[PDB]
Amino acid sequence: EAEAEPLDFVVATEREFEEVLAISGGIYGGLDYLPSRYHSWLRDPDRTVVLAKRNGGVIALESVNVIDAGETVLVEGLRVAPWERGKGVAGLLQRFCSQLVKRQHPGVKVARLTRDDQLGPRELKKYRLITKQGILLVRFNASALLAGLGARLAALRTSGTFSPLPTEAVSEAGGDVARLLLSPSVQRDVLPGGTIIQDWQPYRPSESNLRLLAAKGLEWRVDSRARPRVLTLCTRPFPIPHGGDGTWRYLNIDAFGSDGAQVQSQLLWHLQRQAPRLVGLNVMCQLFLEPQLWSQLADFCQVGLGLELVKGYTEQYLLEADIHH
């Protein structure tokens, strides 16, 4: 039997927040960002958050955000209520959003997205793979980490097993971020596929996108400003549904470059910066890094720092497709 009422595609408002939460159970294994980000998304000037409604009720959501100086649309948040799946809803919503972008933003030439699902024949036919990073996910209680880290690092140093390597400060206000990310050699030799990936969001390295990044409260670290080889990027932690008790936060660190020892020392630096602000909370810390470094960093986190590995090796894929008419 066909549905009594038609689908209606509308721009999201704050009125639908609770309905959106109610269709989002279990998404991203409890690491879903949308509960914490929905209000922000509605304020973003180049973003359209589209809801599919049936008979006045929200059954699906998709975000399209225009970045890269008008040339790219990033697709995020695609989801259909569990009780409405398998009927083509996501396909219809994707088509509505793509037509909306083509109508309102004629300058958009490509769509981009990131995901960690295994790429099958269907993905490889439709998308280009721009780059990929390995994904390392660990968990810790912030207070417990802070209480033991001094002793841990002391024992690691006395044993000659590990001593933090020097790292260098990176100030956005001071211009260090722009001097790094606008360098053609940093783009070629450090950034994965010449792209900034920040908490799953890809940006071409341009001044326009640096303004967007500057507003997010990111923290950066580098091995050397004068001779950059490893650059790390920490996104401010945010609440996630995992655990159901409100105590969990997601701490995303993107690591760019090939020197595993510098990724280790910069990871430690970010943990020491961020954990004091999370006293009383629990942390899902997800590190993205060059694939050949994953085993080294997994051992550093598990054996060196005593952190619990949540899952085995997976990959973050940056995918791109051309816009067609």
Numbering used by the authors: 47 to 371
Paper text:
Here we identify the intracellular NAT16 as the human histidine acetyltransferase (HisAT) responsible for histidine acetylation in vitro and in vivo. Acetylhistidine is synthesized from histidine and acetyl coenzyme A (Ac-CoA) by a histidine acetyltransferase (HisAT, EC:2.3.1.33). Our results indicate that HisAT catalysis occurs via a ternary complex, and the ternary complex is likely stabilized by the oxyanion hole generated by the residues Gly123 and Leu124 of the β-bulge.
The HisAT crystals with CoA disulfide were obtained in the presence of histidine, arginine, and imidazole. In the structure where the buffer component imidazole was found in the active site, it was positioned in between Tyr74 and Trp246 in a similar way as the histidine side chain. This affinity probably explains the difference in enzyme activity between histidine and arginine, but not the poor quality of the other aromatic side chain amino acids as HisAT substrates. The HisAT crystals usually adopted the space group P63 where the packing seemed to be dependent on the crystal contact formed by the second CoA moiety of a CoA disulfide molecule, formed by two CoA molecules covalently linked by a disulfide bond between their thiol groups, at the active site. The crystals of the P63 space group invariably contained a CoA disulfide. The first CoA of the CoA disulfide bound to the canonical position and aligned well with the other molecules bound in this position except for the 3ʹ-AMP moiety that was poorly defined. The second CoA of the CoA disulfide was positioned in a cavity formed between the helices α3, α4, and the β-sheet segment composed of β5, β13, and β6.
